[model samples]
Target: GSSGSSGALENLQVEASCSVCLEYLKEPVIIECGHNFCKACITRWWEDLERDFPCPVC
Candidate 1:
């Protein structure tokens, strides 16, 4: 049973990915709008906000 489960999992692909880089999330963070982004991706994203720190998804 364990062996079969492992095989199934190996064939499975993660549906969740970073919205920004469009890559598999490394350090994932979910926004208020329910989108996920990598911490590294969002950290750079916030840098673009000169004044207001609005949700990147917005």
Candidate 2:
């Protein structure tokens, strides 16, 4: 029988990386509190704002 298990295994191997920063997330940050983006993501965001910022969590 031609089971679909092989396809599923292939799909699992194909992990999708983030397109924005082009890096694997060691610690994925949820975008909440106005900005909970990835560490690099928020760093860029703050740089764009050009000011000292507060933590997204607090």
- Highest TM-score: which candidate? 1
lDDT of 2 at 7: 45
Q: Best candidate per lDDT, number?
A: 1
TM-score of every prediction relative to native: 0.48, 0.34
Global lDDT of each model? 0.67, 0.52
Q: Candidate 2 lDDT, tens digit per residue, 1-58?
A: 8756534544434433333565666555544444335666666666675555556445
Evaluated against the true structure, the overall lDDT of model 2 is 0.52
Model 2: per-residue Cα lDDT at residue 9: 48
User: In candidate 1, what are the lDDT values of residues 1-58, reduced to their tens digit?
Assistant: 3444443445546557887778775456776567777777767876655545567666
